[PDB]
Design a protein around this ligand. Structure first.
Ligand code: CA
Ligand code: CA
Lengths: 148, 148
């Protein structure tokens, strides 16, 4: 998955005080992994459009709000490994272009930001929520699908 | 505002089957106007990053999900005028760079996609909602703020 199980749990807990059922974490990981993949697919397209042989941070379609959530994640002093993210993404078609070092280190942080955003979306959908189950996740995904 | 009152009303109905009044539209329009402005502000940064003095479509940080929503909007046969969008954006500080022709024509569509996404978020917050109250806008905005 994108990160260790305990890592997912730690983000859900600290960011929104939520406890995610293990039977849902795999899907959460694949869902956010797919969103991260989409950020990179758009980034590769932008890199080629600008005549570059490498993908850089500006190539990723990260809007101001997501950027601020990313900073929100960074303030959590939570270091996530790169390997699990790259391995998760490798299940999908490989990018043609090399990603710049700025982006490589960014990927795990983005994974964290995505989980943080996802957890908070769940909280907006159900303010008193504590233990989301399948149905909460399906709904959270529908919301995410609208903007990311 | 970003569009005619009639067009806002139409998008809210076609997108989420929601009704909207005056109090709603002024707040909604300004919020989405600011979101659209932010896309452009980031686009300007991206244009400059790529050594251009003109903003093109790839510069806009449009993630795949938002792009799908734009395509969803385009399927609603609701053509929006460019001028109301530019007038709305004029209330904010002008960018240094001019936008290219393809971006100009895209702006109204983005305004429409944003309304479509906003209405659908409101609907997710409460599938039984018919007319969004201040409570709902506050939550819908918080959801958008996490991603845009
Ligand atoms: Ca070019
Ligand atoms: Ca560069």
């Amino acid at each position: 998955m994108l990160m260790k199980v305990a890592e997912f749990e730690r983000l859900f807990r600290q960011a929104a005080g939520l406890d995610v059922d293990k039977n849902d974490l795999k899907r959460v990981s694949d869902f956010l992994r797919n969103k991260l993949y989409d950020l990179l697919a758009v980034a590769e397209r932008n890199a080629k459009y600008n005549g570059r042989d490498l993908i850089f941070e500006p190539d990723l379609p990260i809007a101001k709000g997501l950027q601020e959530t990313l900073q929100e994640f960074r303030r959590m002093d939570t270091a996530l490994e790169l390997k699990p993210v790259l391995d998760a993404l490798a299940a999908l078609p490989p990018l043609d272009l090399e990603v710049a070092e700025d982006v490589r280190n960014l990927l795990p942080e983005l994974a964290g930001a995505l989980v943080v955003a996802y957890a908070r979306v769940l909280k907006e959908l159900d303010p008193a929520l504590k233990n989301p189950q399948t149905e909460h996740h399906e709904r959270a995904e529908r919301v995410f699908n609208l903007l990311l």
